[PDB]
């Protein structure tokens, strides 16, 4: 949110390259008039299992030569992970002071 | 005659063809022939200089639109059957007021030839079942010919099959056959090749096969599996041929609603290649092939939208014998696709291959398949000794 309030300042849009993810019928039959799978033989739609040292999924859109890693549907991840830091000073002895209390076994 | 076939040709030769069997036909000791007045035969000027006997209307239906591009052309052009009848006294009518049109097939030209008509819903039809009942390996028909009421039983199964019945018995009667010869006509045939062609080996899972070359086609055989509803549905799903990919969404459409598990095979992929055919498969109805990337051993278990099972599959051997492997005990086993195709094309491949004869042979070898066959579901199959 930080970033996309900083684009907002003086930047020109996102990146549709940025903008690329994988009831209603998710599985469209409307979309695929408009990506290759189409009246148009050049089925630039993707394919999977394709071998090679190359990218089956697009990452963006080739590159960070690395993996992308998963964030979990934008949920539990990195809110139970920065907890970690509170759980650092307790599970750390030097770091604490405290006072006296109970010795060293209050915290 | 009897039992040759001279080789098929083309979907339609020009009349010299034509001609060139009718005289084989007449001088061979043949006395009569069954023509097919197909669109195209009819529209390339050749009903002109042929007499017609009988004309018989089984069944209408709107397909191939962007040729008939309105419905009054469609009505006219199929009409022209009719409309070459000139002598009412040695020429009949076989028409079907089931359909809504049938006085309007009859008007356009001769109406003095006389109707005889075939329905079985609509009972006000001069031959009607009376009695009508449909199984997977029975069928029995009261039948209430001009002539009589009449027993027929066979195991010929589909509804459009009583009416195709129906309609040759209508046509006996406008040449006033007795009703044994139009029994022993009917009872003549066992298997029409390569269409809802039943094998039963020894087994009680019906295998039938079409033509299928329209996803209509596997709905229509879907409606019947449902009017005949078997304890578990198994279709195999063949593949298109070229870049027709409207099809397959809705083919799996109503393979995936009107089948507990489904199956797919590679059976016409002379385009491209393969993988990308069953990619293809999935395309417009809503459920995405993203999965089958991330299967890990995690996603072999899934239960598509209806709770049903999923499918994957190409090497057609292995497909066709698991899909008649899968049969436990009165089941429903389509392997259908492509029908009385005797070979197998795979982009670039040409070689022998029946569906039928792999049928049989599988219905064999399932006395092998009695020694195993635990964790029969959905996936995986026919190893044991691993849990």
Known sequence: ?107 | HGDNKLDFPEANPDAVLVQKLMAKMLHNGTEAVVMEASSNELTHTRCEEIDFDIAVFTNLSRDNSHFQGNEEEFRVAQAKLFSRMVDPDRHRKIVNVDDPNAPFFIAQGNPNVPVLTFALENKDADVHPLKFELSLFETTVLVNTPQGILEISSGLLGRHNIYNILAAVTVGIAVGAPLEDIVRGIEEVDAVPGRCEVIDEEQAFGVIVDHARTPDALSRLLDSVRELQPRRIITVIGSCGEKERGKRPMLAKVATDKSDVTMLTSDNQGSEDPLDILDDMLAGIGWTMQDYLKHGENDYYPPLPNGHRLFLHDIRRVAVRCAVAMGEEGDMVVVAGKGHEAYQVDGDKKEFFDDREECREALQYVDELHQAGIDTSEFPWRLPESH
């Open chain 1, 1 to 107: 949110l930080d970033a996309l309030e900083t684009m907002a300042k003086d930047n020109q849009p996102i990146p549709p390259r940025a903008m690329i993810l994988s009831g209603y019928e998710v599985d469209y039959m409307a979309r695929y008039i408009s990506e290759g799978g189409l009246t148009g033989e050049r089925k630039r739609w993707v394919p999977r299992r394709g071998k090679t040292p190359l990218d089956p999924d697009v990452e963006g859109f080739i590159y960070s030569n690395p993996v992308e890693t998963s964030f979990k549907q934008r949920c539990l991840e990195e809110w139970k992970i920065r907890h970690r830091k509170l759980l650092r000073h307790l599970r750390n002895e030097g770091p604490a002071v405290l006072g006296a209390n109970a010795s060293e076994s209050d915290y």
